[PDB]
From TrEMBL, chain A:
Highest taxon above the source species: Bacteria
Organism expressing this protein natively: Photorhabdus thracensis
Cellular localisation: Cytoplasm, Nucleoid
Covered range of the whole protein: 644 to 692 of 1482
Subunit structure, as described in the record: Homodimerization via its hinge domain. Binds to DNA via its C-terminal region. Interacts, and probably forms a ternary complex, with MukE and MukF via its C-terminal region. The complex formation is stimulated by calcium or magnesium. Interacts with tubulin-related protein FtsZ.
Family assignment from sequence similarity: Belongs to the SMC family. MukB subfamily.
Protein's name in the database: Chromosome partition protein MukB
Ranges that cross the membrane: none
Entry's free-text remark on domains: The hinge domain, which separates the large intramolecular coiled coil regions, allows the homodimerization, forming a V-shaped homodimer.
Length: 49, 50, 49
């Protein structure tokens, strides 16, 4: 039980880290393709700096 | 994958070229003996362009 | 290097050699996506070894 609970925390931590990764951390799964399929730019990327 | 990576690389390259071009203008018409200007020339290697 | 090159004067040899290392900032965006995507394989390979 302790092993599994710690495993749950570790999974949550990796998922949290992964959301902040790339390219400008966002809902990257579809958003990058959705950004180029229209003549647009992701807002979070405009506010990168 | 593929195209999107190329686009981010291209935009990064473009932004660096533009910033350099802005820095470059501040150094126009500087007189040092017979030298009259200075530049930072930026180019893309072929083996990577292809 | 910057300070002492300014102090003595002249076109610094060391600055000239590594020009890109001095004038260009390093960008993480291009990389960390692929470090995270690569992670599952890295762990598996290390475990196998």
């Amino acid at each position: 039980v302790e092993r599994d609970e710690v495993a749950a925390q570790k999974r949550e931590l990796e998922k949290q880290i992964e959301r902040l990764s790339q390219p400008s951390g966002a809902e990257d799964s579809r958003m990058i393709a959705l950004a180029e399929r229209f003549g647009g730019v992701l807002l979070s990327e405009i506010y990168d700096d | 994958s593929s195209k999107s990576v190329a686009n981010i690389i291209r935009k990064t390259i473009q932004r660096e070229q533009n910033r350099i071009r802005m820095l470059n203008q501040g150094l126009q018409a500087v007189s040092f003996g017979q030298v009259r200007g200075v530049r930072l020339n930026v180019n893309v290697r072929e083996s990577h362009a292809i | 290097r910057l300070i002492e090159a300014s102090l003595y004067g002249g076109i610094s040899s060391a600055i000239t050699r590594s020009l890109r290392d001095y004038l260009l900032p390093e960008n993480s965006g291009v990389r960390k996506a692929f470090q995270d995507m690569e992670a599952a394989l890295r762990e598996n390979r290390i475990t196998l070894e």
